[PDB]
mmCIF file of C-alpha atoms in Angstrom:
data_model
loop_
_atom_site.group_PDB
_atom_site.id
_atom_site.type_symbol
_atom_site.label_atom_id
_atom_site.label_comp_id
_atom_site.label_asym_id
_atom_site.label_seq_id
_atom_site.Cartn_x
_atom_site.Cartn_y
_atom_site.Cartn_z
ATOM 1 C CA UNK A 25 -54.470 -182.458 -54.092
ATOM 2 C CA UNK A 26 -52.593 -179.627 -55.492
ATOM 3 C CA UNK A 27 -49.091 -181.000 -57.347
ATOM 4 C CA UNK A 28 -48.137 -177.519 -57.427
ATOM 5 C CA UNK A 29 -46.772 -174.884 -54.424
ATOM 6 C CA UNK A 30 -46.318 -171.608 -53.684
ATOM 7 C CA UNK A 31 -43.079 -169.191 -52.771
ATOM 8 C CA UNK A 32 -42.361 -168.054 -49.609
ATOM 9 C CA UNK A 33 -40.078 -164.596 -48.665
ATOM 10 C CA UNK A 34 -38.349 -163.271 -45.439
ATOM 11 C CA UNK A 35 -40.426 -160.508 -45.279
ATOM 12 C CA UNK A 36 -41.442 -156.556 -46.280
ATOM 13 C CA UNK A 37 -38.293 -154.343 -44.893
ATOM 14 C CA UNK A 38 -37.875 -151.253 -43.411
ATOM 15 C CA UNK A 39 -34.048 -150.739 -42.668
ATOM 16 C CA UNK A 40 -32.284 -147.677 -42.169
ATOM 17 C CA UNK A 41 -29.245 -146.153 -44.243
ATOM 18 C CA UNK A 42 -26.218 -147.896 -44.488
ATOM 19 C CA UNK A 43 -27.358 -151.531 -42.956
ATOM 20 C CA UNK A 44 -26.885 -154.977 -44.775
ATOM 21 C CA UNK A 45 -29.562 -157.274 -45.082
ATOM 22 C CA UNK A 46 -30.092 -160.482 -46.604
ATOM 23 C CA UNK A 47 -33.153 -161.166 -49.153
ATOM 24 C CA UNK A 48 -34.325 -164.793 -49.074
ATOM 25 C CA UNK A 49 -37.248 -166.745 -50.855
ATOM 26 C CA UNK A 50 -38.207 -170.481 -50.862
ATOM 27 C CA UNK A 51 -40.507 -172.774 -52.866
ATOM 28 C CA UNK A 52 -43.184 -174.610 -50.918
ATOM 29 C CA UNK A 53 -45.768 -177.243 -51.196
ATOM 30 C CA UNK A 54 -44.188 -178.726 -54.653
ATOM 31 C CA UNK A 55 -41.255 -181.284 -55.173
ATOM 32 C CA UNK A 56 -40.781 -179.461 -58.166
ATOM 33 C CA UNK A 57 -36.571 -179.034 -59.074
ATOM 34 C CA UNK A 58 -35.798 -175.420 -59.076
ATOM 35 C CA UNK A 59 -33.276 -174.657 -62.030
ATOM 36 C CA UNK A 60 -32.546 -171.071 -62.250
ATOM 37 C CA UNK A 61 -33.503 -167.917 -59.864
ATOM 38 C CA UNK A 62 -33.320 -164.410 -61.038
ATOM 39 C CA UNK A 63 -33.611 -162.203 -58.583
ATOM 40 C CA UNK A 64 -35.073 -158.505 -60.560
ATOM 41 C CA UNK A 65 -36.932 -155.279 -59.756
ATOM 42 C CA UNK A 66 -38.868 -153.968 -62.454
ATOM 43 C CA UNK A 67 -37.152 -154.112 -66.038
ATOM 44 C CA UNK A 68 -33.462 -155.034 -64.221
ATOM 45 C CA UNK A 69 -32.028 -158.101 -63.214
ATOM 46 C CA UNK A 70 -29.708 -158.115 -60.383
ATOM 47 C CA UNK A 71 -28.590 -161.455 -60.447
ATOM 48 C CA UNK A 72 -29.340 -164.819 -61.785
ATOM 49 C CA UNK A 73 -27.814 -168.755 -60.888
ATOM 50 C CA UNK A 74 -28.139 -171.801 -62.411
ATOM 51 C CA UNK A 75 -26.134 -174.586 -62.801
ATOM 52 C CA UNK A 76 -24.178 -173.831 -65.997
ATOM 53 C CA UNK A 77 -23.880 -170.157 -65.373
ATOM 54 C CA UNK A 78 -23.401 -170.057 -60.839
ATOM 55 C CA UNK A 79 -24.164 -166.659 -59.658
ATOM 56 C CA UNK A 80 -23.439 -163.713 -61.702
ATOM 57 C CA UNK A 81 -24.259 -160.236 -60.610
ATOM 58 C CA UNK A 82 -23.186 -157.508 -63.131
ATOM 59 C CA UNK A 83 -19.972 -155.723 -61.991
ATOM 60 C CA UNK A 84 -22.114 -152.085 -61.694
ATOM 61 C CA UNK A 85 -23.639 -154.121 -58.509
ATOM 62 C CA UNK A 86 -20.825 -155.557 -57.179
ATOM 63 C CA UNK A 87 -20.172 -153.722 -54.218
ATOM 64 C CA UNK A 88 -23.895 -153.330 -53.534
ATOM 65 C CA UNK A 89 -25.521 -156.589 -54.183
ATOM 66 C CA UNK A 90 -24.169 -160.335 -52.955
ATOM 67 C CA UNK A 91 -24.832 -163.627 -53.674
ATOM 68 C CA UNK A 92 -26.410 -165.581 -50.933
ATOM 69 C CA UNK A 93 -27.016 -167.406 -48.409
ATOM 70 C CA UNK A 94 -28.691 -169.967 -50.690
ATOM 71 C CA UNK A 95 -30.462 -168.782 -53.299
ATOM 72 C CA UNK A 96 -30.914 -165.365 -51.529
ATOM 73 C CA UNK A 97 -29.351 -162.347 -51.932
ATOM 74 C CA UNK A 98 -27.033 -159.825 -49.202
ATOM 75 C CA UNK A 99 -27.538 -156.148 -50.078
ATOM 76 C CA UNK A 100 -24.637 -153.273 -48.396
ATOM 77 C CA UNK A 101 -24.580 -150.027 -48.122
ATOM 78 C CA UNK A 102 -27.830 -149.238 -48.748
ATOM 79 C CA UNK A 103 -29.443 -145.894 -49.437
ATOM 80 C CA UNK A 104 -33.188 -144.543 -49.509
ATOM 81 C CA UNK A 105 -33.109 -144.972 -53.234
ATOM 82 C CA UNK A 106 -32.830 -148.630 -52.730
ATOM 83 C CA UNK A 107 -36.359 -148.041 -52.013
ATOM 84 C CA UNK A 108 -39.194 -150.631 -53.875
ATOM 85 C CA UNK A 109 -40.392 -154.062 -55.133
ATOM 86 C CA UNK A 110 -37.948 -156.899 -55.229
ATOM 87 C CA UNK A 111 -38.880 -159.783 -57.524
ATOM 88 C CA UNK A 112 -37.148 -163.341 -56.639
ATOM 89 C CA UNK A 113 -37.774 -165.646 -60.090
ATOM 90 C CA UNK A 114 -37.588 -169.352 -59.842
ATOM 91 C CA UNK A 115 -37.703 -171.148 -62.697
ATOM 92 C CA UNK A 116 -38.820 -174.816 -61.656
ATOM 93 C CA UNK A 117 -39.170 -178.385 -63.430
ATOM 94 C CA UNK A 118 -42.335 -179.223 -64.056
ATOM 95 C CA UNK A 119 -43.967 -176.619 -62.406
ATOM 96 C CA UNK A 120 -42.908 -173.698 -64.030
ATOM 97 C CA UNK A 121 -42.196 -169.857 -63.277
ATOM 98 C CA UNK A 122 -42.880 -169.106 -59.859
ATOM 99 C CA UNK A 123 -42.082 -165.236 -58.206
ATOM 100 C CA UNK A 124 -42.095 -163.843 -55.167
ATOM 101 C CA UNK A 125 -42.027 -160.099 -53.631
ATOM 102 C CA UNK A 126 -40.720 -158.179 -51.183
ATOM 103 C CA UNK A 127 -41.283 -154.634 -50.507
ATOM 104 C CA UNK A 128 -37.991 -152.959 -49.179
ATOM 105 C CA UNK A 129 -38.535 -149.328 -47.479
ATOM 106 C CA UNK A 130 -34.702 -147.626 -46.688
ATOM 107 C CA UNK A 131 -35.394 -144.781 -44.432
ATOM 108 C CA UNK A 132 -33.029 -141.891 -43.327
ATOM 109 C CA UNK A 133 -33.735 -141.757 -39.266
#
């Protein structure tokens, strides 16, 4: 029996300039404690929560990047360079480092 899981996302996106959309992930198959997420693209991290920091986004993402619901994310205004991989990060107790992708296309139609 496996003692360990495996992370689940709301999906690959295509959205369309301008839209909001909400970016969600969730451990499965372990009782493992989760005790930080980072949520990152490749070298750059977005935002990041755990108990002694709560959420903090840096202020250059403030008005395009939200915390929540949950341990998910809400992105605004987005444009077609918001275009690419999405890395959700949970760091878990005993498990370990789990991560999960989602691809996010932002087209122009």
């Amino acid at each position: 029996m496996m003692m360990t899981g495996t992370i689940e996302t709301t999906g690959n996106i295509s959205a369309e300039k301008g839209g909001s959309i909400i970016l969600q992930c969730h451990l499965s198959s372990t009782t493992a404690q989760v005790t930080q997420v980072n949520w990152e693209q490749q070298d750059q991290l977005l935002a990041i929560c755990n108990a002694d920091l709560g959420w903090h986004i840096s202020p250059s993402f403030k008005d395009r990047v939200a915390p929540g619901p949950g341990l998910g994310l809400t992105l605004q205004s987005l444009t077609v360079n918001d275009t690419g991989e999405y890395f959700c990060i949970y760091h878990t107790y005993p498990d370990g480092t789990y991560t999960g992708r989602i691809f996010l296309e932002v087209l122009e139609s």
